[PDB]
Design an enzyme around this catalytic site. Structure first.
Site: not given
Lengths: 53, 217
Positions: B67, B116, B139, B147
């Site tokens: 992302g 993502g 992350e 996520d």
């Protein structure tokens, strides 16, 4: 004969006004209709496009 | 005028979704997520689409490097918190749509699939890996969390040393990169297909259709 001449003139003038009003309405309706056609719907996402090219 | 960020094309009865941000390694922004989320709802209603194929136009360089969080960082520095929450509502809503999608989705993880990108494949039962696959969840080094529903997928799909989510915690907390065959053997990838065979596979996917009176769902 006086009523015939004055009713005929009134009819002619009233007919020109009605046509002008009717035409303007039709023109406005056409713009609205066209605007609805150009409105993007969700189904348009499924139509393949090559806009850049 | 500019090249669309995500390109949609028809492959017989299959609908191909291609990520088209090569310079950003196919990073996912709010625009991309929103476009894909809306187009997938339409395909779900359609009775002419049997399956969807999520791929990239940059393979084998990358499928999705993650992302677009660098843009979300600028938002935080500018107090544009509404913009940031829009980016995560779109992305997470797209990950939820893919997970619960009733038609088969086949992701071609031909390249870097990190962040993502993992959300685009981890939620599909048909997540194909290749020799060029590089799965990672980096992350912890950026200060964010795992996520895209990776805390619901990894603890349920990993194959080895995952009785108590031990391996899931190892990948999420260490950010280790898994490559190709290793991703397939760990359960990160459902299938292992050579990149050279992806073109042929795509054509076969478009040609297969539910038989008799069976729907694609």
């Amino acid at each position: 004969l006086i009523e015939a001449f004055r009713k005929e003139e009134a009819r002619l003038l009233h007919k020109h006004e009605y046509l002008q009003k009717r035409t303007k309405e039709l023109e406005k309706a056409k713009e609205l209709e066209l605007e609805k056609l150009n409105k993007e719907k969700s189904s348009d996402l499924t139509i393949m496009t090559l806009d850049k090219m | 005028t500019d090249a669309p960020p995500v390109l949609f094309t028809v492959q017989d009865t299959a609908r191909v979704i291609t990520l088209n941000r090569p310079k950003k390694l196919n990073a996912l922004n709010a625009e991309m997520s929103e476009s894909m989320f809306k187009t997938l709802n339409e395909y779900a209603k359609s009775d002419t689409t049997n399956l969807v194929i999520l791929k990239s136009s940059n393979r084998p360089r990358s499928f999705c490097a993650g992302g677009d969080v660098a843009t979300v960082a600028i938002f935080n520095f500018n107090k544009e918190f509404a913009k940031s929450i829009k980016f995560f509502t779109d992305e997470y809503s797209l990950n939820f749509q893919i997970a619960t999608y009733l038609k088969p989705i086949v992701t071609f993880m031909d390249g870097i699939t990190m962040g993502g990108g993992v959300g685009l494949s981890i939620h599909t039962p048909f997540r194909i890996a290749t020799e060029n696959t590089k799965w990672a969840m980096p992350e912890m080094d950026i200060g964010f969390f795992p996520d895209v529903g990776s805390t619901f997928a990894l603890p349920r799909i990993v194959t080895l040393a995952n009785s108590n989510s031990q391996m899931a915690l190892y990948l999420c907390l260490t950010g280790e990169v898994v490559t190709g065959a290793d991703a397939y053997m760990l359960g990160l990838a459902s299938h292992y297909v050579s990149s050279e065979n992806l073109d042929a596979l795509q054509k076969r996917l478009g040609e297969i259709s539910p038989p008799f009176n069976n729907d694609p769902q």
